[PDB]
Amino acid sequence: REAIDFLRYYAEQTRRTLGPGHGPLGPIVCISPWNFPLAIFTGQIAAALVAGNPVL
Amino acid sequence: FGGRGLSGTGPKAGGPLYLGRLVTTAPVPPQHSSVHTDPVLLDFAKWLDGKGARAEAEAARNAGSSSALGLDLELPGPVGERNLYTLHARGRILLVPATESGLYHQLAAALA
Amino acid sequence: APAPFADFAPPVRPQSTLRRAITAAYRRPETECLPPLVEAATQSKEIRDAAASTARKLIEALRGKGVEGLVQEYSLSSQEGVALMCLAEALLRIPDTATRDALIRDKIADGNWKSHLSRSLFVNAATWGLVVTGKLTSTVNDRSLAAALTRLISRCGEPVIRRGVDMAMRMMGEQFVTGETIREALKRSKELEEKGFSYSYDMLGEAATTAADAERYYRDYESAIHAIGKASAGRGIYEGPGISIKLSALHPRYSRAQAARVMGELLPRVKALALLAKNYDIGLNIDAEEADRLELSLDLLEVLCLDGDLSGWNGMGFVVQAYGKRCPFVLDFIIDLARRSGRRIMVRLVKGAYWDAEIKRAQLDGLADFPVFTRKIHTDVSYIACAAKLLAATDVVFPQFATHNAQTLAAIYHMAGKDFHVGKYEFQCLHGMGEPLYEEVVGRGKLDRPCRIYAPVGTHETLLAYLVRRLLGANSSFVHRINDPKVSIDELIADPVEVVRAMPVVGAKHDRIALPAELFGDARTNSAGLDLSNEETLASLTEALRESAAMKWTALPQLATGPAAGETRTVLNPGDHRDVVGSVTETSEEDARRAVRLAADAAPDWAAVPPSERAACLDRAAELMQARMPTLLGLIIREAGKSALNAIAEVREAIDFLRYYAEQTRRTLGPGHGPLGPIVCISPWNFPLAIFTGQIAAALVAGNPVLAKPAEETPLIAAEGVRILREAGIPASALQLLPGDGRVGAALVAAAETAGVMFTGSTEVARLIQAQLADRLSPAGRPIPLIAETGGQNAMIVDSSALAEQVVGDVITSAFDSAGQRASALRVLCLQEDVADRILTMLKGALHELHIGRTDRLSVDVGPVITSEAKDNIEKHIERMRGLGRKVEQIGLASETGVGTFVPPTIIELEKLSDLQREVFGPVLHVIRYRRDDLDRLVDDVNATGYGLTFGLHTRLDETIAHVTSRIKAGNLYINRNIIGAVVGVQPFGGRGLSGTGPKAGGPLYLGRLVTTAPVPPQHSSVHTDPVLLDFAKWLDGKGARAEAEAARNAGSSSALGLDLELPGPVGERNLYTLHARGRILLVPATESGLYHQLAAALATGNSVAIDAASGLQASLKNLPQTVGLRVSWSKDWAADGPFAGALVEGDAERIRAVNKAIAALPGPLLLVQAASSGEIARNPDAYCLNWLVEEVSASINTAAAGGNASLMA
Ligand SMILES: Cc1cc2c(cc1C)N(CCC=O)c1c([nH]c(=O)[nH]c1=O)N2C[C@H](O)[C@H](O)[C@H](O)COP(=O)(O)OP(=O)(O)OC[C@H]1O[C@@H](n2cnc3c(N)ncnc32)[C@H](O)[C@@H]1O
Ligand SMILES: NC(=O)c1ccc[n+]([C@@H]2O[C@H](COP(=O)([O-])OP(=O)(O)OC[C@H]3O[C@@H](n4cnc5c(N)ncnc54)[C@H](O)[C@@H]3O)[C@@H](O)[C@H]2O)c1
């Protein structure tokens, strides 16, 4: 559920905010832990991606 | 979700400041504003006016308005719970200026 | 010399039987109005079924067929939609289309909009909020809107800006108005006139503030009549277009109080417009306004319809409001006038547009009931009953049924029956709102009944002024309900007549709206006022006032043993020294000293009267004053020079004090709250009944016998107040009256048995009393309590978002009401530079519409100043300012003022606030200008006077409200209203610094100062703990001072710092009461433990401290945490380190007396000093009472200022 919520929340925050002047950083390295191995994994990656950054 | 000190850097995961850290120019998050103006910022702006530092005084007034310090929101959630989100001062900011004008701008940002 | 009150308020004309029937219904109970309306509105079962079918068909058409689509297309939030429309509004203020488009493409869309657009973008965001969300907010969250505008532009750029511009252009040019100018409106009317509609044009003028404004509205109406009549081209008054006017647009003093000027000056103007309408044969309709203008407008209608120069024309029209209780009786009068004159009067029946404001005004004025219904369904029944009356008289009047309610329409359609011809009656609707409904009505293919469109005409500026009232789509509104999908058609076609008929109590008042008498519920009974627009009231008051002037009023030294002999002199009317009001016998200094001794002897007997019974005496005195109000008014008018309106409000305030302190007593006082003993009450001339009564009632009900020393100028009303309190049961030994001057006051203050002094008056005299009390201690060895409520230097700050007409009304009232002889009066008006010229022009024009004279005439706005000495003092200030080159504006006084002591209302333009150095207690307004960036420095300048009584702010912007109210230091704040007339228990009154010691009169801390152990007031607590107090308690625990750390934590809990309450009051206002820190407290300790207890008390209440360095206790505060150190200073020279806001002293009796003398000698404000011995600190945790270490702040916010009351819309 938390992974789903991260995806939908960062999607909605993107629709509310991001425009052509909010340029991406570039490649983002997302390093995640074993204790939320889907939710924190997905949350970091989803945020970086939807902000316009490719992810490792 | 997220904290301060040894608990991390912020911004909070699952919160409205998160995406702004992942772009080179941050947007204005939804509902991110405050009608409160820091009183020490106001005193600093008047001091700058007295010195004739008109550009810096203007920057200080603008920082005072655009600061969201004092934001106090209730977030939608389940019944039987009240879920609050607030923006407070961070603490003591390390300022590393090079020029007098840069120092005045950094001070305005921190005070605001 | 004119006889007193012989010309008080004569009516325009003798009241006919029909006119008296109107006045009799003004405030008739709602349960009495409805039954005859239900009877008149009843129709046959066949008709009701037919009407429901017709209404269903119309509503089905309406549901089966703008900004919403824009919000959807760009996924805008509500705040983004509002911000976008404010931006579009600002861009449309750029006249040239090409430069606007370049600003959008090259500067607005590409980034910073703030750089390119003295006035907030968001000044009208309350209006656009209504457009976008359907909900009204009184003030604008301009920081939220700025954030949303930046967000939406950065997200969507130029396209969303262009769409917003096009949307706002359509709405403001085509939807909210028919056209920007009358020519444009006339061009756009051809389309629907070809479909069977007609038009009535509204030039959006109302509420003239100045003669120049009234002349502007006149020439605007005249030019419109020419354009409409040229276009009418002989179509006549039924097929062709007409005009609608508001009488308040045509004269700046359109009121019953100025009836003579209205008939002399306003009437000829309306006649001239009507003559032009007659020559073109168009309709001219008089719109209906507030309830207190209804009957006045009938006098103009009567003269116009009887004027032979207007004969031959049937175009005169007149609105009647069905939400008003007088409506059927007004219609009887109009129908009869139409018969007598032979004029077929055009009668527009509306429901009514001022509902919120009428509820608020009746509550504020303490009147018997409302002049409008309180349930919407009652207005609907009234409308239908009045339509039946009008449909029975179509041979003599032309009924015009203005409504958008399809059920109301259908009921009238079938009520009117089958016979119809154009000219028999018509329907009416509002442009851009009723055409969907009436496109189903007009024409042979529909119901074949005509409809006249009410068409607003004006620029964007004019449109936005009163657009909020027009939108109030409330909640019970048909237009709101037709759009609500949760509302079925069956609900929409419900018959209000049958619903009212079947309710348990027909006509019951709305459950959630308080009658004025019940504003405070079970706590106490509100005082009742008098309606000076009611002819029955004016006629009764005329006689009661004349009778009061025939009385041989006297004031005598009324000792416990009986009246005493003394020097006797007359009391003269300050408006005319030929008018002798009465005689005063003044008190010898020997008898004043004797009075205190008798009070001390009688003190045990009065203290033994149980608190509940003492409060019963106060309630009985309140009943007596309410009953005697007309006579008390007359005395106040003639002795103190007050207008009738102000005298009513003063007697109300006296009644309110009596009932408030009685209730506070019943809530708090018990056996352990022992009286102080004899209390000397010294009162000023300017509220000679209310402040006089307030101080005495508080002291008496707290269990103290009282020596009452009234101002030497106003002894008669004081003697009458004492007579009333004694009649109510106050024993003669408990309340003694000592008339005379300050020497009598001084002898009372100096008397050995005086246990407390309550003073209201000048700061200079209070300082003399403080110096005399500094020599004295109570038998217990504590300072003699002094409550001293003194002057003000009160400011109002106005920014470019405020509404100039609102500002000018509140400034004229605040500065010149009572000839500026209120402690609360506005002394310094501060105008933002970009609106200062326009507001100042309006203010000067309004100044010259004031009537100055002897106050036994209702038409007088401003009376005299109290004495020749006061007049000389005030005029000396004016001439000094004039001698310095400052611009001075003064109205010219009539020769009749020569027999009294008058100062003309005066406006003085200053360069800096420091040009003004002392309170000038008269009708003298000072004006300064400021740049918006210097607002914070301006607030500094206001605080820098050292005063802190009343303060006003006019702004619509939340950021400015938050800033200014957080930085101003004053006891009574007012937002978007005037700054005078604080109400007992609603705006508890009193300030800080040079303005007083506190506690506030009419507030919950007052009685506790008048007993030796203060009670816990109602609602007096706080869950907040001062964080520096907590740091200090931890520091104490670290130092091993465990008992003191415990006492510090207890102080932190016991403190009520942070209390934040809303007090009950009228609708349309929010009245807040809060407890703050006082400031910097002077600490004068003797021992280490004493210092820790003093510091704990001060920090727990949010204060900083200056500690007496001569105590030698510096080593007791080694290594304080920095948070506490920030609050602590050491003072060798107390006078150099002030002003302080209070003091805490430790020592024996001789030490306390010596410190008290040194504190009294400090410059500036009187300090509330608390003293205790070291032993008392050890024994009594409350040795220093936290009640006196916080500062009370009252704030009153006019939440109807945006044009309506959102809470009442539900
Ligand atoms: C259509 C129209 C309206 C008005 C005027 C002309 C025309 C053609 N006219 C001039 C325009 C304004 O200056 C006018 C109006 N009102 C007024 O006081 N003086 C005037 O000269 N006009 C407005 C009119 O009174 C009314 O406000 C509206 O048309 C709305 O009424 P409508 O009948 O279309 O809607 P309903 O929803 O069935 O009724 C709403 C009205 O009901 C009353 N109300 C609301 N709450 C109430 C409570 N709690 N108690 C009692 N009455 C209540 C109000 O009167 C509300 O307006
Ligand atoms: N803060 C408030 O609530 C409030 C309300 C009304 C008026 N005021 C102030 O009152 C002033 C005007 O009223 P006023 O002209 O009657 O005030 P004042 O100071 O001239 O006299 C007030 C009373 O003090 C008495 N008095 C004069 N000298 C005295 C002395 N040496 N010892 C004892 N008593 C003495 C007078 O007889 C009078 O009864 C204004 O400064 C106004 O601001 C304050």
Ligand SMILES: [Mg+2]
């Ligand atoms: Mg005096």
